[PDB]
Design a protein around this ligand. Structure first.
Ligand SMILES: Cc1cn([C@H]2C[C@H](O)[C@@H](COP(=O)(O)OP(=O)(O)O[C@H]3OC[C@@H](O)[C@H](O)[C@H]3O)O2)c(=O)[nH]c1=O
Ligand SMILES: Cc1cn([C@H]2C[C@H](O)[C@@H](COP(=O)(O)OP(=O)(O)O[C@H]3OC[C@@H](O)[C@H](O)[C@H]3O)O2)c(=O)[nH]c1=O
Ligand code: NI
Lengths: 196, 196
């Protein structure tokens, strides 16, 4: 459903990217603000949130704070991600499947705010562009990043025009030096089962 | 020297309230805003984050978004909490130990922004007042909401003047009806070890 407040917790797969799940999150508001169970393990497993997420006992919660037009992305590190927005902001979420197979290069985009979350399987590149004045982007992962290991990780350039995606403002996107220099899709080695 | 960006991940005890920990979180700023590892299990266990948090394999992440002068709490819920701020806001965090023993009624207060987090053991009442225009307050807990546990909650009234705490604006606090009506510390039954 579309309403911000009072949704039933529910999940829907994304047809073009196997394993991806889009969730409606219940948010309850009053005069003071609002409250959500952003992630609730017991309730999300029966909806298809994969038990394999928890198999290694690894957990990290990352948070970024970004202004309008900031674009972060296409990142496909060897871990799963559960993505959401923790404040009143919104982003255009964007995904490109980098797994070896019939879905290599498939894409999806959707607007994320505090009432929506996304499960992104390892091997699918994650990104977003900030639509609101600012946003708090909070996500859970199940393996641990190291600066030194970044050469081992998979990335694709947000600006590669052969990708079937449309950013809100490509030309004035506010980006890192790293995201400027990631390889185009044709130079990305598709991720095999054994690389994940 | 300023104390928001580029801190080393570190933990400290709160002398007055055993089992509590205050963390300095590394927040990395750049042209886009900032990024933090809000929680990182592998890096946080060595600093004393209790393994008992994970013993039952339960996990829930809550978020509340609150407007200025909102004051929530003094609630000792039947589970541990790991608390932090996910956006550019700040709160005055406030704690009152409700455990049976020599620290019953002990208090602590400190300002929490995205560069700080707090581990609150079960039995210690949690609360905050919003100092910024808005704030995204994101926390992890290790059990799930259930009416079978409501007998294991304890509450103290935020405005009991005999509490060794001071709020920023008491007079202009925006408080729920329920929070207005919690018992004064005198009329709270200390939580025993069996209740956690
Ligand atoms: C704790 C909790 C609450 N809720 C619902 C109940 C209400 O409809 C809504 C708002 O909660 P309130 O009972 O008004 O409590 P609130 O003042 O928002 O306080 C909560 O956020 C701040 C936290 O410090 C506190 O423990 C927590 O109870 O959220 C949930 O759906 N799941 C939960 O786990
Ligand atoms: C990913 C990560 C980064 N960092 C540091 C390195 C930088 O100083 C800073 C920003 O790192 P970037 O790689 O520029 O992050 P960003 O472009 O925001 O992308 C991150 O969030 C979106 C996610 O898709 C992506 O995996 C993750 O790298 O944070 C950490 O300390 N720990 C981390 O896990
Ligand atoms: Ni041990």
């Amino acid at each position: 459903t579309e309403n911000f407040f009072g949704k039933t917790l529910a999940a829907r797969p994304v047809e073009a990217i196997p394993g991806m799940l889009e969730f409606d999150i219940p948010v309850h508001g009053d005069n003071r603000g609002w409250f959500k169970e952003n992630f609730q393990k017991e309730k999300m497993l029966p909806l298809g949130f994969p038990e394999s997420f928890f198999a290694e006992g690894k957990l990290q919660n990352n948070v970024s704070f970004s202004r309008k037009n900031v674009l972060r992305g296409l990142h496909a590190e060897p871990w799963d991600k559960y993505i959401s927005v923790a404040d009143g902001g919104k982003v255009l979420g964007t995904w490109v499947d980098l797994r070896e197979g019939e879905t290599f290069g498939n894409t999806y985009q959707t607007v994320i705010d505090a009432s929506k979350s996304i499960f992104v399987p390892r091997g699918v590149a994650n990104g977003f562009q900030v639509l609101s004045d600012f946003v708090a982007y909070s996500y859970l992962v199940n393996d641990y990043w190291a600066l030194e290991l970044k050469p081992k990780y998979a990335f694709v350039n947000y600006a590669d025009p052969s990708l079937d995606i449309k950013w809100e403002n490509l030309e004035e996107a506010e980006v890192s030096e790293a995201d400027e220099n990631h390889p185009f899709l044709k130079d990305v080695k598709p991720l095999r089962k054994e690389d994940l």
